[PDB]
Design a binder for this molecule. Structure first.
Ligand code: SRM
Ligand code: SF4
Ligand SMILES: [K+]
Length: 456
């Protein structure tokens, strides 16, 4: 199990060819697994560092995870600057020994594809006239919980304030250091930033950050999110360039009979001008394709099965690795999702909502890697074939879903969703999401202050 440091998920075609080779020749599974933190993993490594180092990649005493960056902004020109900053924060934070692992992101509204509320530190980009002028800082997100332990909880990030671009690194360092200093020294399950904030208070923590950074936060500048999904298919970028985002189920890249996904990506990498971008939804973007090259790229993706059409539901569903490789797995996630979504697709069709989607995620255990604690419908593994069903998040991911039913099986889960999707399809207002509806309709009480009301 090896994972690479790849800020913003940007990887070159040369780097791709190198990782594709190693994956096929030096691992048990032979696959490339795209993660939801915009990087990749090999499974069952049978030397990798030399391979990495040779193509300029470095495999991550360091409590630091991959720094995320919105992959395909509507305003395409903003990506270059934002990415530049994600890369700088990444290198800046690179080795202090943090108690727990620290997760950071750079977000470009109105997209929350990187799922900011699952992270310790977030810089929401504010642009004026096509140029980034600063960041709104949100601190304190985290999703890991422990079954039945009411002292643990998922928490959304808190707004601290706005800072000019020039203060970015000073602020990044200051948040890291006060968490390091104030973080719980006695217990690891309470060492994360979300716990520290609740213990000392946001304002107390905020004041310390200003003190250390040598700045005073300005008031938060307006920002809104409209979604978290990728933009599957072709989208027009800057100049004569186009971006093709490929939906990859579970981000598992392998050649399947009649679906040579892995070889197809290699062929594209051989002729692709620009580079690739691994998304926070475990998908892949063939970035910067000249209009002249569109048909060539599309031909390979099409033939390889990389452009096989799926429902909007499937495009908005996610699961963690879980079995067979995860040592902490309680229930299947990745291997369960495909057939589970097959069933949800039938349910959506039955109720006349085949064109709709519900952000649905399955996580193999409460550690929460699948980000089910930010979904409209989240399934959390409790034991083989059994999950806790959570309802009530929203499409943009700013609300934690409360547990609706505990320790139930797939058949029981489907029966409940059949009933609820049916009600939503008929009783929902115009453009109302499933999560919001369950809260509006009184099907589940919302989680308003996680540290205090997440658990019944
Ligand atoms: C691959 C990935 C899920 C996926 O299907 O994409 C993943 C996979 C695993 N995670 Fe994670 N996590 C992944 C995103 C996350 C997320 C979501 C996110 O960051 O966007 C979370 C929830 C947010 C959070 O941190 O609160 C998450 C919370 C955890 C935890 C709980 C940490 C905690 O604070 O309590 C653990 C266990 C631990 O580290 O103690 C963990 C542990 C693990 C390990 C490395 C298991 C281990 O400790 O040995 C899993 C490897 C499974 C395997 O065989 O590949 N993973 N994990 C993601 C890899 C991200 C990356 O490239 O770094
Ligand atoms: S949520 Fe649990 S089962 Fe899934 S990858 Fe994370 S640690 Fe493993
Ligand atoms: K995916």
């Amino acid at each position: 199990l090896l994972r690479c440091r790849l800020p913003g998920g940007v990887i070159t075609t040369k780097q791709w060819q190198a990782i594709d080779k190693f994956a096929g020749e030096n691992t048990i599974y032979g696959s490339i697994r795209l993660t939801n933190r915009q990087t990749f993993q090999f499974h069952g490594i049978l030397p990798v560092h030399q391979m990495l180092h040779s193509v300029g990649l470095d495999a991550l005493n360091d409590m630091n995870r991959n720094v995320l960056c919105t992959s395909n902004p509507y305003e395409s020109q903003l990506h270059a600057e934002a990415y530049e900053w994600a890369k700088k924060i990444s290198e800046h934070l690179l080795p202090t020994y943090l108690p727990r692992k620290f997760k950071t992101t750079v977000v470009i509204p109105p997209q929350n594809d990187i799922d900011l509320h699952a992270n310790d530190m977030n810089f929401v980009a504010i642009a004026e006239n096509g140029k980034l002028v600063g960041f709104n800082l949100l601190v304190g997100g985290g999703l890991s919980i422990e079954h039945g332990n009411k002292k643990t909880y998922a928490r959304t990030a808190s707004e601290f304030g706005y800072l000019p671009l020039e203060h970015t690194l000073a602020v990044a360092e200051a948040v890291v250091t006060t968490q390091r200093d104030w973080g719980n020294r006695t217990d690891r399950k309470n060492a994360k930033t979300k716990y520290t904030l609740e213990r000392v208070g946001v304002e107390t923590f905020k004041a310390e950050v200003e003190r250390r950074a040598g700045i005073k936060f300005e008031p938060i500048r307006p920002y809104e999110f409209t979604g978290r999904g990728d933009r599957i298919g072709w989208v027009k970028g800057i100049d004569d360039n186009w971006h093709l985002t490929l939906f990859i189920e579970n981000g598992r890249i392998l050649d399947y009979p009649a679906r040579p996904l892995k070889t197809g990506l290699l062929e594209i990498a051989k002729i692709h001008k620009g580079d690739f971008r691994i998304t926070a939804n475990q998908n892949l973007i063939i970035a910067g394709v000249p209009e002249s090259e569109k048909a060539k790229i599309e031909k390979i993706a099409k033939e390889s099965g990389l452009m096989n059409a799926v429902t909007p539901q499937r495009e908005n569903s996610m699961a963690c690795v879980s079995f067979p490789t995860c040592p902490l797995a309680m229930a299947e996630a990745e291997r369960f999702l495909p057939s589970f979504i097959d069933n949800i697709d039938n349910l959506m069709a039955k109720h006349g909502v085949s064109d709709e989607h519900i952000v649905m995620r399955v996580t193999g255990c409460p550690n929460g890697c699948g980000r089910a604690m930010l979904a409209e419908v989240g399934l959390v593994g409790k034991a083989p074939g059994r999950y806790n069903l959570h309802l009530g998040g929203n499409r943009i991911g700013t609300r934690i879903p409360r547990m609706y039913k505990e320790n139930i099986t797939e058949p029981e889960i489907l029966a409940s969703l059949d009933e609820l999707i049916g009600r939503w399809a008929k009783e929902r207002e115009a453009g109302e999401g499933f999560g919001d509806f369950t809260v509006r309709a009184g099907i589940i009480r919302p989680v308003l202050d996680p540290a205090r009301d997440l658990w019944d």
